Amino acid sequence: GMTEYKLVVVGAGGVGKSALTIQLIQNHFVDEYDPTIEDSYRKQVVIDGETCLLDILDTAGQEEYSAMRDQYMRTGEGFLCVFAINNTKSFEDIHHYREQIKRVKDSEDVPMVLVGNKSDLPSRTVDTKQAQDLARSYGIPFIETSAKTRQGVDDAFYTLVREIRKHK
Ligand SMILES: C[C@H]1CNCCN1c1nccc(-c2noc([C@@]3(C)CCCc4sc(N)c(C#N)c43)n2)n1
Ligand SMILES: Nc1nc2c(ncn2[C@@H]2O[C@H](COP(=O)(O)OP(=O)(O)O)[C@@H](O)[C@H]2O)c(=O)[nH]1
Ligand SMILES: [Mg+2]
């Protein structure tokens, strides 16, 4: 049967979670997508010759630490933790997202990729070295993306699928 992989995209508002997701789903850059919309989208993709079904949850909205939200995030098998390379605050929030994932999955080994988005922009405030070193601290991959140009998009999502396969 075709394996389905439940992937969750997290990170500060405005980093490009929706743009990245819609790039994967539509193969089109969408510069405007209602920042409140949290939803899930499926795509069949060929990853290393295997057609698998991706189910991507593009998260949005305020923090909610209810039992219900924790149960829903626990459905995720892997997580993209996204920051924007021109927004320091978004990078400094990454540890919070990683800590919430570790808590809800009750594991120090959750499949995860660190994503530095907006790589097409000239306004960098987060050095690539600093981001690579954060991923090294966590023992996870780091991928540089642009939802605008499609740089890194398959790399981010497909690496996460390979991380889940190694974990299973
Ligand atoms: C960085 C902080 C603190 N300063 C203000 C901004 N902020 C913030 N804003 C908005 C959202 C969040 C935030 N944290 O974790 C999560 C997620 C979706 C990540 C995946 C695992 C779980 S499990 C659970 N119940 C979740 C929630 N709600 C989450 N989302 N964090
Ligand atoms: N230049 C550029 N802008 C982007 C990129 N990804 C998203 N954006 C812009 O960043 C803003 C937030 O994107 P959005 O996908 O709504 O972020 P979300 O709140 O994390 O879902 C919008 O103004 C998008 O046009 C990217 O890779 N490059
Ligand atoms: Mg969004």
Question: To what resolution in angstroms was this structure determined?
Answer: 1.0
Q: Which ligand is nearest to the CA of 69?
A: 1
Tell me phi and psi for residue 70, to 5 degrees: -65, -45
CA distance 54 to 27: 15
Structural domains of the chain, with CATH? 3-167 (3.40.50.300)
Other Cβ atoms closer than 10 A to 143: 25
Closest residue (by CA) to atom 23 of ligand 1? 70
Contact assessment for residue 83 and residue 91, using Cβ atoms and an 8 Å cutoff: yes
Query: Which secondary structure element, helix H or strand E, spans residue 146, and what is its range?
Result: none
CA distance 138 to 113: 10
- Helix (H, G, I), strand (E, B), or coil: what is residue 77? coil
Contact assessment for residue 130 and residue 95, using Cβ atoms and an 8 Å cutoff: no
DSSP string, 12-39: STTSSHHHHHHHHHHSS--S---TT--E
Contact assessment for residue 107 and residue 35, using Cβ atoms and an 8 Å cutoff: no
Atom of ligand 1 nearest to the CA of 93: 1
* Site to substitute for ligand 2 among 118, 119, 144, most atoms within 8 A of C-beta: 118
**C-beta 118 within 6 A of ligand 2:** yes
CA distance 104 to 107: 8
